[PDB]
Amino acid sequence: PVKHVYRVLQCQEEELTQMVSTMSDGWKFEQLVSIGSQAEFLCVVSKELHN
Amino acid sequence: PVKHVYRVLQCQEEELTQMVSTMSDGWKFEQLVSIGSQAEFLCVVSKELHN
Amino acid sequence: PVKHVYRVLQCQEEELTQMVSTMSDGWKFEQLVSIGQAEFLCVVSKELHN
Amino acid sequence: PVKHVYRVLQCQEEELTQMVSTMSDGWKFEQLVSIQAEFLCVVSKELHN
Amino acid sequence: PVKHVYRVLQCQEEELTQMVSTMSDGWKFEQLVSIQAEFLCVVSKELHN
Amino acid sequence: ASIAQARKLVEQLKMEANIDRIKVSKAAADLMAYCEAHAKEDPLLTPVPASENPFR
Amino acid sequence: ELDQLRQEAEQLKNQIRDARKACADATLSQITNNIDPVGRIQMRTRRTLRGHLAKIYAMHWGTDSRLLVSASQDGKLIIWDSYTTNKVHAIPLRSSWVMTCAYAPSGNYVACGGLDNICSIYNLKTREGNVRVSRELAGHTGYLSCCRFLDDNQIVTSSGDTTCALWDIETGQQTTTFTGHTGDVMSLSLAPDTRLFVSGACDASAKLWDVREGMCRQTFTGHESDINAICFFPNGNAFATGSDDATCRLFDLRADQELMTYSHDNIICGITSVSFSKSGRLLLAGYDDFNCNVWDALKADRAGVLAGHDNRVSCLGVTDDGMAVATGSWDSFLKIWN
Amino acid sequence: IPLRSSWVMTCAYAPSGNYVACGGLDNICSIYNLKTREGNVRVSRELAGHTGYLSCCRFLDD
DSSP states (O other): OOOEEEEEEEEOSTTSHHHHHTOOSSOOOOOEEEOOOOOOEEEEEEEEOOO | OOOOEEEEEEEESTTSHHHHTTOOSSOOOOEEEEEOOOOEEEEEEEEOOOO | OOOOEEEEOOEESTTSHHHHHTOOSSOOOOBOOOOOOOEEOOEEEEOOOO | OOOOEEEEEEEEGGGHHHHHHTOOSSOOOOEEEEOOOEEEEEEEEOOOO | OOOOEEEEEOOBGGGHHHHHHTOOSSOOOOBOOOOOOBOOEEEEEOOOO | OHHHHHHHHHHHHHHHHSOOOOOSHHHHHHHHHHHHHGGGGOTTTSOOOTTTOTTO | OHHHHHHHHHHHHHHHHHHHHHTOOOOHHHHHSSSOOOOOOOOOEEEEEOOOOSOOOEEEEOTTSSEEEEEOSSSEEEEEETTTTEEEEEEEOSOSOBOOOEEOSSSSOEEOOBTTSOEEEEEOOOSSSSOEEEEEEOOOOSOOOEEEEEETTEEEEEOSSSOEEEEETTTOSEEEEEOOOOSOOOOEEEOTTSSEEEEOOTTSEEEEEESSSOOOOEEEEOOSSOOOOEEEOTTSSEEEEEOSSSOEEEEETTTOSEEEEEOOSSOOSOEEEEEEOSSSOEEEEEESSSOEEEEESSSOOOOEEEOOOSSOEEEEEEOSSSOOEEEEETTSOEEEEO | OOOSOSOEEEEEEOSSSSOEEEEETTSOOEEEEOSOSSSOOEEEEEOOOOOSOOOOOOOSOO
8 A cells, every 4th residue: 555754854943944845856844843942943854665 | 647736724713714724726635734833824725737 | 626614713721621622513623723721723714615 | 324422521630541442433533722730622423314 | 453552661851853754564643641751652453353 | 930020020120210209208297296286295304292103 | 212211211210219308408417416325234134024935026015005915926815914924815816827916006906917918807805795706808829927906997918929908808709909019028017107018029118108098108129139128217207127138217308318327346136126115216126146235326336235035036026105024035035124 | 955865975066057967876967957947946868778776876967
């Protein structure tokens, strides 16, 4: 059936919109967490690999 | 096959209902975060387009 | 080809279970934030096809 | 077509693993909120009649 | 889609990337709560039999 | 090609040629009179009390 | 054989210039020396309204004089209330380069466009409470540069593939088409009486068309770089342009000659926007030196300077009644001056 | 840029300035086109043919 790959990304507040709005092709969006805030968020992204 | 676009919107506390209740035609809702909380928020929004 | 409607509801801590367990017919559950003794928020959704 | 039923469960920090790892048959997991420490939890079931 | 299994994993701040990037086969990701700094994580599997 | 280009040339430039060409001093005097007459319509140059401007 | 045609074109140009030279009969310095200059001025910033999280590129007031629109880099529009500093709408977009913005004089249309080669119209006022797109206007293969409404049903665009044209909203196809602009068009503005408009050029050229038929009646020249901003004096007989090499020139339609020139020694930056006031006594300009100063029209002397920003200034606007000035830089803040 | 493989040991930059490359125990070298329409990064070409683990990568030209 299906598979998944997960990656973690770190970014400050000033450079959040540029990465979110300019994401790659094929990767999805998962929970956004606030860590040690200032800022220092943590994104999680996913891709689906079939065969 | 499928694609996706993401956008980040900032909205203060008192003007939250007016923005959430009156979204556009096609855009979805994914997550609301509390940032620097009078009180500030963030709201990721997604659209799905094919071909 | 589907549509969605979103609404925001505020409920204090004591009035949370009674509101969650007795939702209407058709509406869904999306998010629950801890605003601000304690105060909460909530987002619901419906699918108005046709 | 489909329906849904929602319930709110409360649990302290020490009793989280036992309830989460031993859920019933049919109920899902949707949200875990943090109010030592107290937690909340929302579960759902689909009733097609 | 007839069964579900849920598990709770704890990981410190320095051990996030190694654990998330190297998950097993067939397990999903659902939540990540902020309990240095500690964390929690819930995963799921589909046992259709 | 360049024939078409020269065509366009003769076509417009000769349209430019037959235009009226008048005095400049009259235009300058008219501009000065227009600027002086409407001195009452410039809040920036003529200050107004705080009750006038809403942006405060 | 085309050499003869080129030679006769050259001699016709020479004859036209000879006819043009004589009619210049006013050096405005020696006639306006008598009148006294304006006094010094200093204004205070009143409101600093935030909400964009990218680099702002455009803005535009409305006839209501209490609403203004803004477009960011990643795709977003926000319609602001200047009195209370509250946003009334927030529209997401499907493209990541929006370099233009227009608002409708009636009050229920907004247009956009950019490097995605499509112009879209948005219907703010709907029977239902949501906002939805109305039409899209494709047809030109360059990147869109500017958009101005002639009226609620007529729009004029400025393409990048040496093209300017009009459109009909209901049909969705072009009505008239303009050509003959060798360089690249980057700006244009409308006359107050909604009958004429002029367009800028990459190779320092000015053109003046008519909306009804489309005949180029005069032509202006004199700069040595791209003309980025074009504005009009309120009366309607003169337009002042700017350029990258720190020069501002005021031309006269009847004279066809450059009247004055506003240059100062200690400037090496480029001009990005110009605008006249209500009466027309002062002229404002913006610099890529992170600042902005206010000039004078008649005597070519600087009245004062304005406290700039932390990055480049890229837009400027003055309300119709003249009680507001709004400026937007690349660091995502707007300023209100009075 | 995220990657699909979990072992990359090499990285190169184009002298012109709009290409990069990667490689590791995945036995594949991938080229990325930084400069494109709008803002996004998408894979341009994916190479294959050698059964060892890639070790180094250098551009002679674009």
